[PDB]
């Protein structure tokens, strides 16, 4: 069990050498912006359906990354996402953690770009976009199975048709967490299992001239 230390924020995780790199490319170039931001915890219940967060809309009201994006015009960065779950050896279930570039929803501004809290899917069989859930694994994905492992890390590079873009209108990719196999337990245990997401930007550049 190791303990990472980036900036003025340290987390304690297992040094797990089973990371996935999205399409085999490392984030490269074309003070306190590289740290470990930790979002809120979502409570997995027996009837939950799914959650999603749009990037980089989730980090526009948080920290120095939130104020740098609201001043500069142009923007370009990679990311590094860490999702982990905390359950005892008497619960069962499985999660699917996959990214999806240019995620367009289907039927307001408080639903397409929800911010830092995230939103909840209504029809998780079709991902609220008409595409089926069963073929989601063509994307960079990782299986969280509560029997064996409690960790999943994806490295996401910059994917866009132009080398620089705005940070208040466009949203590159949306991360999806869907409970394929539902949660089950006997009575007398903890009914709600927490899920914790941790983001860390890699190779962030701003050339908006503010």
């Amino acid at each position: 069990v190791a303990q990472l230390t980036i900036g003025n924020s340290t987390i304690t995780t297992q040094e797990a050498a089973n990371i996935v790199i999205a399409y085999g490319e490392w984030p490269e170039y074309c003070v306190s912006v590289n740290r470990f931001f930790t979002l809120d915890t979502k409570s997995w219940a027996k009837d939950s359906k799914g959650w999603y967060w749009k990037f980089p809309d989730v980090l526009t009201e948080v920290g120095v990354f939130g104020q740098n994006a609201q001043f500069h015009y142009l923007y370009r960065s990679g990311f590094c996402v860490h999702v982990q779950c905390n359950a005892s050896k008497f619960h069962q279930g499985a999660l699917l953690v996959a990214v999806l570039p240019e995620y367009v929803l289907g039927t307001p501004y408080a639903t397409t770009q929800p911010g830092q809290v995230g939103a909840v899917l209504t029809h998780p069989y079709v991902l609220d976009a008409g595409i089926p859930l069963s073929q989601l694994t063509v994307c960079p994905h990782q299986w969280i199975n509560l029997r064996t492992n409690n960790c999943a890390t994806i490295i996401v590079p910059y994917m866009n048709t132009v080398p620089f873009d705005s940070a208040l209108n466009h949203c590159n990719f949306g991360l999806l967490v869907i409970p394929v196999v539902p949660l089950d337990f006997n009575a007398g245990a903890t009914s709600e299992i927490p899920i914790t997401v941790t983001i860390a930007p890699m190779c962030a550049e701003f050339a908006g001239l503010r």
């Binding site: 999205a22 399409y23 085999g24 490319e25 050896k89 008497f90 619960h91 069962q92 279930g93 499985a94 998780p124 069989y125 089926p132 859930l133 069963s134 073929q135 694994t137 063509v138 299986w143 199975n145 509560l146 029997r147 064996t148 590079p157 994917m159 866009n160 048709t161 080398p163 394929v180 196999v181 089950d184 337990f185 006997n186 245990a189």
Partner: protein
Amino acid sequence: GIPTELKPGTNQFLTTDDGVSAPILPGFHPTPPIHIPGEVHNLLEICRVETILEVNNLKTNETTPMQRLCFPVSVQSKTGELCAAFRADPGRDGPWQSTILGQLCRYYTQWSGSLEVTFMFAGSFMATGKMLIAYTPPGGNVPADRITAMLGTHVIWDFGLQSSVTLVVPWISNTHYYFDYYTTGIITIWYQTNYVVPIGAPTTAYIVALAAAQDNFTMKLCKDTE
């Protein structure tokens, strides 16, 4: 004034003629490309990723279609009895319509090669047991009980140690014509031992079935779908 002839076959518009034409804008310069990661050069590189088979495709599950992705094991079932059964048909209807291999084989006419099927246990940590994954070769018959299925090709999967196992189908083939010449087998799941569970853990579990193609899977004769 060189002498030339006009053979039969002039002034016809063949729709698959790969010739060159006069550009509408000769002075224009298109935008030079940049490096975008994730380039696809061939469609078979999408055919080699594991997607979820839909084995539990009953008639009552059309109302709540999230239950179609996994099939259960239970504690009340006897030992030595059948769990689930399906044949390996990436072209035809059934469970393989829900994959990415079963959707790209609707765009073609002939294909052949080998597949591989990967299972995954999603129960509690404290339970254990054994399952038998029997594969019937093509042209044979379905096994009637556990003892005849053991004599064929089979793996013994105990989910108390490994939470996943793979099974390799040796060869499939198809020449479509509405009838198709189709040589495939049948995969069945047998309860080796019953489900054993301590006090406090839940009684039912679920299996998810993943499927993907191998290296030597090819296809030909592109055809527009229904």
